[model samples]
Target: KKIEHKMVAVNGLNMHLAELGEGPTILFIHGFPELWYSWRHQMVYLAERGYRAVAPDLRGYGDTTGAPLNDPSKFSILHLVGDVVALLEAIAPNEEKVFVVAHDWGALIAWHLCLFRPDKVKALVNLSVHFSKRNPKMNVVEGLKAIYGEDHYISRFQVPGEIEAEFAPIGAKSVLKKILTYRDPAPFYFPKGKGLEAIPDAPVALSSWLSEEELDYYANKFEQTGFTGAVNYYRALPINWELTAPWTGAQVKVPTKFIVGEFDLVYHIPGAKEYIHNGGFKKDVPLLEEVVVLEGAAHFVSQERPHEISKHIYDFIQKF
Candidate 1:
């Protein structure tokens, strides 16, 4: 109830921002099929403890508006990063840097935020996704298809409108529930018109971590905004790949702490475990200080273990 919402003009869009508390700002970035609400638990937790937690719905998501959802080029990583650059300037013009925490697609953008403008970030705590150096040779979608075949979720997302049509029959609530509660370490797939049919039901019922009320919040927003914009993030992968060539070997210079669920699909990628555990993560993110793998957890680690994640963020950013 303490969270305050507002629309801040940023990067030619009216970015919807939810904020609380007052002090050091912690910018929380949520992922695909998510909104600022995804960080609801962390926002209140950090706010009560003397930090201002701010989460924006990002372009084309939730109440935020202005991106042309039909144009995949408009959702490139550069555009996402640009929106953030403007948001920081608009919200905290006087402060040179602010603490950042992100998950999933948000974590991916956070990595670029640091890479593109390290000067604007004091420290970072990212969950689920990690900084993997860009491959100059191949685009992201191509690389994924090579490894996981055509049915991989990201691969399936390459075709515009196709996935949207598949998702329509399933409805937003079911789609969100399936994706958010997914626990198996196996690679996610969406074969042809099957959509998410292969994904088994949740281990049991929807657990306490995600009450129906909370799920409804997410479902309602996606129902309005539709998944087209969110899916465009994936559609623009090749564009992001081509545009990031100049940063091929660029290292994320911000101080970082990464946390991931033991069963996170990204963490289980063929060589992902070794890359994260065997110094590769540290190599790309030199300032990376700690890596926490939450055993028995899933991809939605922030929501699944809010208090612990908040504690981790507080502990890490406080050191800066």
Candidate 2:
């Protein structure tokens, strides 16, 4: 109830955003199947501490007027960053830069944003995902193909409408439930003539971090928007990868903090654990000052440990 929602013109689309608090701006960017609501917990806590927090339903998601998925390239990371740049300009024109906290896809975008436009970011606290140095010859699909091969879910996402049909029979709530409930770190795949539901059903007990009401909140927003916009994020991956040719070998120069759950699939991804700790990550994100591994947590570390994550962000960014 304390959050204020508004529509702002950005990147030629009407964008829906939520804001609370009234101090230094902290922009929260959410991942796929999630919206600005994903950041509400942190937003409320930060706002209470005399900081302004802004969370936008990035173009093509909840309550946002744009659906760039119609043209997948428009859903690329570049486009998402454009929306955020416009949002910051419209809301805090006087501020030169803003602090950012992001998860999953948001984290990926945050890395790219910082890499491409360091002047617009003062610092960042990213969750789940890490900064991926652009590879010159290989787009994301080609990279994934080299690693996970044909059946990988992301590869399957290359073809539009196919995944939607796979999802049509599976149902939206069920699809979200699977994604939110997933804890397995292994490569996930969708064999030909199959969708998310075709995989074995794992009976997941909702985590302590997610309440029925909270799930319902996501359900309500996505129900209105459907899953296409969210799915398009995956569809746009190759295009995003193709468009980022100029960023090959670039680094994220922004001051940053990173957190991931002990069980986060990303944390356990083949070389992820080693890279984050073995100085390789440091090479790419020179200013990344802190890396926290929350025990007993999963992918959604921010929501799963809201209080701790909030303090982590507050402590790190407060210094700047």
Candidate 3:
């Protein structure tokens, strides 16, 4: 279960990563409010099973550096995808491809990586997020409205400075704590099919699986990286939609899988299931090997149900 830490330079960025065990590489890309530590469960499980499980603090998060702060566009999905490609080249220089897994925003980058550079990734798995279909004519907001109703909070984040104040008071660390500890599914999704307007102002329930000490580890890391860089991911969503529009109708050709917490609001988002079915993978991109919904778990699947998550990942890799 011991994880050996390492650093690799990728496209002028000092990428902080962790490696465990040895065999074919299983690269894990973490999402917002997270670092390589987010994959602690999968890393140890895969490593114990003989895969060289690796997880990296993508771009601006964790100890990784060389990401441009002044330019919000630099954090676009394409740029983040490029970072993964560079990391792949450095780690698996001789290998033709590797298994890749991602969650949330990490899943966003992973989707692009598969679309843009399928040869580098042999198989893929994503959690909590689904891919959107192409819409060349519509802009970002228009596309989102077409799928999710106008009340989607994600669209609100797109507004300039709208989310700044929300995070400003707590900074990134506190925001990380708030997000990771959030246990109720209501905040993330609309209830009674009422869209996002009916959400109550209830406090986020804390996850029983994670202890305060474990959360402190994640919070401390966020304290070091700050929230601005991570928030930049939201800022660049529009640009990302534009950049990937050209690939509309394109599907991930590699083997694919998806996992979600049964209580996670992701499934409740309008068009969530349909989008995954139609847009995520090619008609022939190979049907998902599994789409697990862990009972009672919420958004932070890795932390909330590490053992179940690890078993699924290990089983999937073994099958392939």
Candidate 4:
């Protein structure tokens, strides 16, 4: 029942990890602009059930050090996976394999980990994103340009200091409220100069799920790290596509369960619903065990519905 934080060197960075309990291990990975705190509820839940829960603050997003300086290569799938692999080698080397539960960016890396180093992973429970098919012809940015005409959410984040600077005057708390509170399925775009301030933020009524203290915890970190390293993730999209070419048409062979909110932005994207429901998703992740769509939930499914999300994870991993 004790939550402990530790710093370990991995992938040439001092990574911050939140850990609890003692038994089989579940390595948790948080999404962008977030810390290991996002998985606190699940960490506690799994720990109480005699499972070891260790959620790490991915590089650039928390106390973890080594955010690349205006460089995308430092945050590639390989780099992230190396960090996790190193963490495991340091902490769970005795175990034959460990479990992974991730969201958003974390989920992306979890897929890569399971695919490339299936030897290290026993199973995974991923949320928010499914394995997006690689575009054989176009890289991620080019494809976004074709769809949204060069000005969409992830596309806008391509510029290095361009996007991060705008958030400066807006402050971290406002930026987080804008991103976390967003409920629409529409792809967001920013005007030439207006940053996200152009989106016209709804009057913030703090979600019962997100408290001032929690927002302070998140905002304080962003305030310290600045967002350049964070957006390095988006800037590296094409790089990930380029590097992941070999994985085209590859199947996620590990036993897994996928979950997302019915209203998640990714879920509502053009063909996302059909892809997931029409077996295209299964075609890619052949061993996918189950899909659970939460009612009334949006993106950040774990945070918005902590107890249910925790139970879903517990129920899924219990079977393994």
What's the TM-score of every candidate structure? 0.97, 0.94, 0.86, 0.96
lDDT of 2 by residue, 1-320 (tens): 48898989888889888999898999999987798998878998999998999998887788888565677767888888888778888988989999999999999889988987899999999999977766678777778778888887788878878777777777767677777766666556777776674444444554656777888888777767777788788888778877888877778889999999887766775678888999989999999896899987778877878899999999998999
User: What is the lDDT, from 0 to 100, of the residue 203 in candidate 3?
Assistant: 44
- Candidate number with the higher TM-score (3 or 4): 4
How high is the lDDT of residue 124 in model 2? 93
C-alpha RMSD in Å of predicted model 1 compared with the true structure: 1.2
Off by over 4 Å in 1: none
Better of 2 and 3 by lDDT: 2
Q: Name the 10 consecutive residues with the lowest summed lDDT in model 4.
A: 198-207
lDDT of 4 by residue, 96-192 (tens): 7999999998999899998789999888999998888897898877776787776686887887777776787889988887788777776677756
Residue pairs with backbone overlap in model 4: none
> Model 3 — which ten-residue stretch has the worst lDDT?
188-197
For model 1, the run of ten residues with the poorest summed lDDT: 199-208
Model 3 lDDT tens row, 1-320: 47888899887789898989899999998987688888988888888888999899988888898887657788988888878888888998878999988998898788788889988888888888766555567665666556666555566555555455555555655555556766555434322333333443324454566677777888777766666677788778778777776787676777888888866766656656665555443353555565666787778898778898888788887777
| Model 2 weakest 10-residue run by lDDT | 197-206
Order of models, best TM-score first: 1, 4, 2, 3
lDDT of 2 at 248: 73
Residue 308 shift from truth in candidate 3, angstroms: 1.3
Q: How many clashes show up in model 4?
A: 0
lDDT of 4: 0.84
